[PDB]
Scaffold this active site. Sequence first.
Site, PDB file in Angstrom:
ATOM      1  N   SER A   1       0.794  -1.216   0.000  1.00 32.56           N
ATOM      2  CA  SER A   1       0.000   0.000   0.000  1.00 32.56           C
ATOM      3  C   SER A   1       0.832   1.273   0.000  1.00 32.56           C
ATOM      4  O   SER A   1       0.237   2.360  -0.087  1.00 32.56           O
ATOM      5  CB  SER A   1      -0.934   0.020   1.211  1.00 32.56           C
ATOM      6  OG  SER A   1      -2.003  -0.888   1.038  1.00 32.56           O
TER       7      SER A   1
ATOM      8  N   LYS B   1       0.106   3.767  -2.649  1.00 29.77           N
ATOM      9  CA  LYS B   1      -1.066   4.640  -2.620  1.00 29.77           C
ATOM     10  C   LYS B   1      -0.702   6.120  -2.560  1.00 29.77           C
ATOM     11  O   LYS B   1      -1.502   6.955  -3.009  1.00 29.77           O
ATOM     12  CB  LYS B   1      -1.954   4.240  -1.447  1.00 29.77           C
ATOM     13  CG  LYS B   1      -2.763   2.992  -1.743  1.00 29.77           C
ATOM     14  CD  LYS B   1      -3.356   2.339  -0.510  1.00 29.77           C
ATOM     15  CE  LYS B   1      -3.854   0.935  -0.895  1.00 29.77           C
ATOM     16  NZ  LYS B   1      -4.596   0.286   0.198  1.00 29.77           N
TER      17      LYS B   1
ATOM     18  N   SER C   1      -5.665   3.269   4.376  1.00 27.48           N
ATOM     19  CA  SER C   1      -5.189   2.254   3.445  1.00 27.48           C
ATOM     20  C   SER C   1      -6.352   1.452   2.862  1.00 27.48           C
ATOM     21  O   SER C   1      -6.233   0.247   2.614  1.00 27.48           O
ATOM     22  CB  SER C   1      -4.168   1.333   4.114  1.00 27.48           C
ATOM     23  OG  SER C   1      -3.229   0.841   3.170  1.00 27.48           O
TER      24      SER C   1
ATOM     25  N   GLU D   1      -5.633  -3.895  -6.353  1.00 34.42           N
ATOM     26  CA  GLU D   1      -5.883  -4.482  -5.033  1.00 34.42           C
ATOM     27  C   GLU D   1      -6.889  -5.626  -5.175  1.00 34.42           C
ATOM     28  O   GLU D   1      -7.919  -5.475  -5.846  1.00 34.42           O
ATOM     29  CB  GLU D   1      -6.420  -3.414  -4.072  1.00 34.42           C
ATOM     30  CG  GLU D   1      -5.410  -2.313  -3.692  1.00 34.42           C
ATOM     31  CD  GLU D   1      -4.351  -2.784  -2.715  1.00 34.42           C
ATOM     32  OE1 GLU D   1      -4.369  -3.969  -2.349  1.00 34.42           O
ATOM     33  OE2 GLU D   1      -3.498  -1.968  -2.303  1.00 34.42           O
TER      34      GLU D   1
ATOM     35  N   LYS E   1       3.130   6.456   5.257  1.00 38.01           N
ATOM     36  CA  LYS E   1       2.200   5.512   4.650  1.00 38.01           C
ATOM     37  C   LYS E   1       2.801   4.124   4.801  1.00 38.01           C
ATOM     38  O   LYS E   1       3.980   3.925   4.508  1.00 38.01           O
ATOM     39  CB  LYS E   1       1.952   5.836   3.165  1.00 38.01           C
ATOM     40  CG  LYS E   1       0.920   4.905   2.453  1.00 38.01           C
ATOM     41  CD  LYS E   1      -0.495   5.069   3.049  1.00 38.01           C
ATOM     42  CE  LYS E   1      -1.424   3.919   2.636  1.00 38.01           C
ATOM     43  NZ  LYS E   1      -1.127   2.770   3.493  1.00 38.01           N
TER      44      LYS E   1
ATOM     45  N   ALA F   1       1.488  -3.671   3.822  1.00 42.56           N
ATOM     46  CA  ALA F   1       1.601  -5.030   4.318  1.00 42.56           C
ATOM     47  C   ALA F   1       1.281  -5.965   3.163  1.00 42.56           C
ATOM     48  O   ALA F   1       0.467  -5.631   2.301  1.00 42.56           O
ATOM     49  CB  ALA F   1       0.631  -5.286   5.471  1.00 42.56           C
TER      50      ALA F   1
END
Length: 261
Positions: free
Chosen positions: A43, A46, A103, A139, A207, A210
């Site tokens: 993430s 992002k 997230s 995602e 940020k 995982a």
Amino acid sequence: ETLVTVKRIEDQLGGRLGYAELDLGSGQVLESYRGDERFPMMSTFKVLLCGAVLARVDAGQEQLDRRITYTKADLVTYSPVTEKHVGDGMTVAELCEAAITMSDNTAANLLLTTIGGPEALTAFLRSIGDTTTRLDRWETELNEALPGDPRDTTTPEAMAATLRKLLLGDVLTPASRQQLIDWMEADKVAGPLIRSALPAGWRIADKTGAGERGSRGIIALLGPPGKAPRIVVIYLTGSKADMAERNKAIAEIGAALIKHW
């Protein structure tokens, strides 16, 4: 000593650790560990995504208050904010805030659609001089972290360099640049990582990420009170550690680079 700590953690957890700490005046790497090896971004991408969105906002191609409508069928795993708004939709700005601050995974997919997908994110990055980082999937498959797989990866040094261009360089207007920092300052889910080691008065914009195969990462703009900030990025992949161990490792690297500022 910080690089010694990194190697000892990598010895202890298994897998690979990557680390880069950037001086902001010059953009030169103060220190790094496996700094040119590829790591899954998870993430942490992002922030780059929201930079691409803001770049389109800056160019008149997008509006922060434009409302995106979506259904329950668009929800992927871990969508704490977007799952509450299937009915009323959300604006571009609210989706960015969800993607960075919580997230939220559907928020990121929704924003990816607005710009043209992972390939368009990679093209945006190429356009600002990052020839290394690449986003290939959506995602949540981009978190798969297969060993050796170059899809959805960056290097610690390349991610540091790109974050400097975005957060402090001229890719974005100052208003949009600060918007990005402000969202990262408002990160809700990074408490157990570098934030847990911060002395009083320090500021951070960060940020986390995982993924599968024991993967974890953080990107951060941080600094002491009254002093200049630095950028740090830390990735790990390939261990059997659980989230709490992964969190502890990153916090321990944060405490070391803080102690040795």
